[PDB]
Amino acid sequence: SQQTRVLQEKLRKLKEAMLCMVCCEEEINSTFCPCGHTVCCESCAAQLQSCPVCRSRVEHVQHVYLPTHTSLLNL
Amino acid sequence: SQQTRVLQEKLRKLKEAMLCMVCCEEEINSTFCPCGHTVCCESCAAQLQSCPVCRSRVEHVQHVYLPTH
Ligand SMILES: Cn1cc(Cl)c(C(=O)NC2CCCC2)n1
Ligand SMILES: Cn1cc(Cl)c(C(=O)NC2CCCC2)n1
Ligand SMILES: [Zn+2]
Ligand SMILES: [Zn+2]
Ligand SMILES: [Zn+2]
Numbered sequence A: 001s002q003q004t005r006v007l008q009e010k011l012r013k014l015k016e017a018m019l020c021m022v023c024c025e026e027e028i029n030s031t032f033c034p035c036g037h038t039v040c041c042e043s044c045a046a047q048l049q050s051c052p053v054c055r056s057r058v059e060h061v062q063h064v065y066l067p068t069h070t071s072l073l074n075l
Numbered sequence B: 001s002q003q004t005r006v007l008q009e010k011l012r013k014l015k016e017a018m019l020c021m022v023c024c025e026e027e028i029n030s031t032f033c034p035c036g037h038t039v040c041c042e043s044c045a046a047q048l049q050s051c052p053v054c055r056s057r058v059e060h061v062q063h064v065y066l067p068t069h
């Protein structure tokens, strides 16, 4: 029904929000510290000097283990 | 249809996975450092001395700003 189409769109948008903002292909699993923005995969976070969202200096990257993780790279 | 019921269940389960594993009522927004388990809201994370997933000591809690918030 039309409701099935609406629910498919909501599911897809929530899953898109869990992907890396730089490569768009891998799940987010890294945090820029100390600002706390958690918007990249490990590969893309590794080479940023400043946060891509707030411009704060990245002192280090903290790996995050999230219950929503489903990609083979995070399991 | 039955597929509408199936998609409603999948969306519900994905939203449940974003909720604090301790209180079940608030969105996850905190990481236990250094282990990296990100499974609690800020109120439950402030009260735990050990990670509820791996039992590693919590040295400090890092707030996470996620695009899904
Ligand atoms: C961060 N972001 C936002 C959207 Cl929208 C997407 C996306 O559709 N990515 C796809 C490309 C390869 C498969 C996943 N990623
Ligand atoms: C962590 N988790 C797993 C499930 Cl399942 C739930 C849940 O249904 N929580 C509800 C209680 C108050 C409204 C949301 N939470
Ligand atoms: Zn990436
Ligand atoms: Zn930032
Ligand atoms: Zn909680």
Ligand SMILES: [Zn+2]
Binding pocket: B032, B035, B036, B037, B051, B052, B053, B054, B055, B056
């Ligand atoms: Zn842990």
